Write a protein that binds this ligand. Structure first.
Ligand code: NI
Ligand code: NI
Ligand code: NI
Ligand code: NI
Lengths: 212, 212
């Protein structure tokens, strides 16, 4: 019982972060269709197991081990969805639910085979990047990690820019003095309410952020 | 926890029958690497759930519902093994263990797709017929069912036979006055210690059996 449950809590926190939603226990209860009390019980165990910390604001911060496990479950889940759609041909309306089960029993080595056999594993069939593939086998340029983080805009410093076409991109995605997600890819891209601005490097080095 | 466990007990009983072994609780404990007491506890629940009867000789007789479920789990298991070998290309030494997990989470509709996509679903990669495909979508000729049963030879009646090449087949598979398995296929075949004699109809109507 217990292992699949933990993984589901983890993938759900992972999911909410990808969606920009604060990982709150009531948000997890609602999404998993579980009671709040029930969720509190599992989260308590997960804290005990070192997988999550409940911050003073009641959000759930996955620890590095928790996040590794979350990432793995998300990876299996999305690879299973790929397998089910691409090869098996299961009706798309059933694919998620099936992968909801298969994600807890797919081995790493099966994953590795899927990566060999599938045409593309960039994205699930539902449009989301498949993470953790590598593991399977302050200025923005300095501050971003290979792990999504929300930060606060403290300076944009347009005045120092030569290229200006991204000024309007920033205005259109609404930040100026706000709280944005930051990541390094193949680098740097910023997000704010499901609107992404992929920064060119000159901007990535002048934009400054803080926690928080 | 409980559903996968029940299915495993069921597939194991199914297995022992296919192998000609009396479904004894100590044989199930040994095969599942579970304690006897532990197995007694689950079997008791399974009796309560209507899936098995413990006969006076201590063998486990699957009820019709139990057998249907056993057959389904065996089917998913073997189809999963096919999928893993044929398409996925998982190392054959890992295929069983993986299917040991996937058998408990594969839906009927995924099965139906597998039957569409796979080259042949007659047999698992380990040489055993895949059952339950139809469900997914006394003289021997009269006594045999579409379900394996052991019976006792009461008469062979060679004297009434025109064709005699199967006389030696019977002698070679060692029966004469013994306890044999009987089944109807595409009919009738008899088995005795992993030696099969597929009867021609003239013999199937003269050979007589009893319980038991
Ligand atoms: Ni999904
Ligand atoms: Ni799941
Ligand atoms: Ni097997
Ligand atoms: Ni199993």
């Amino acid at each position: 019982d217990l292992v699949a449950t933990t993984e589901m809590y983890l993938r759900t926190i992972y999911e909410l972060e990808e969606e920009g939603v604060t990982p709150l226990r009531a948000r997890i209860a609602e999404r998993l269709e579980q009671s709040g009390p029930t969720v509190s019980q599992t989260v308590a165990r997960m804290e005990r197991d070192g997988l999550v910390v409940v911050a003073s604001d009641r959000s759930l911060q996955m620890t590095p081990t928790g996040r590794t496990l979350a990432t793995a479950v998300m990876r299996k889940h999305r690879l299973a969805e790929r397998l089910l759609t691409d090869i098996i041909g299961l009706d798309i309306n059933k694919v998620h639910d099936e992968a909801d089960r298969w994600e807890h029993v797919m081995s790493d080595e099966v994953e590795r085979r899927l990566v060999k056999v599938l045409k593309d594993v960039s994205r699930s069939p539902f449009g989301n990047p498949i993470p953790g593939l590598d593991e399977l086998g302050t200025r923005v340029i300095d501050a971003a990690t290979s792990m999504p983080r929300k930060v606060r805009i403290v300076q944009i410093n347009e005045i120092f820019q030569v290229e200006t076409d991204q000024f309007t991109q920033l205005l259109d995605a609404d930040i100026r003095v706000g709280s944005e997600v930051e990541i390094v890819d193949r680098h740097i891209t910023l997000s704010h309410n499901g609107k992404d601005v992929e920064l060119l490097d000159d901007l990535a080095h002048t934009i400054r952020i803080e926690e928080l």
